[PDB]
Amino acid sequence: PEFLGEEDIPREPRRIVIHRGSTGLGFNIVGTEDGEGIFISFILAGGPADLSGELRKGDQILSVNGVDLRNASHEQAAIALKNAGQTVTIIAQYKPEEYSRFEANSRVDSSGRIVTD
């Protein structure tokens, strides 16, 4: 048996296109007023982000529709995403170590996966 859980999660940036018409994207972001990164904290089962099958908790949102979000505040990133239109092109990059700082009792294992105790 060949388990996915054993192999490394790619750390390279990826392009994800979410086609959502006029509904929510189906995920939550965490960030700071400082601009220390915008990260996916939660993906809604059955929502557009989930249906893409290409985003996960711990992804940093680098940009939306060409708009650089690496140094965005949580609020301005929210605005950008809500107003991104029906077709939303996200560049994301898996950053579990940076993400783990936000969530209590969380850490990264050898596979690169986020674990909460």
């Binding site: 939550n28 972001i29 949580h74 929210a78 809500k82």
Partner: peptide, 7 residues
């Protein structure tokens, strides 16, 4: 510094 938003 922290906040969380649904989108």
């Amino acid at each position: 510094n922290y906040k969380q938003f649904s989108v």
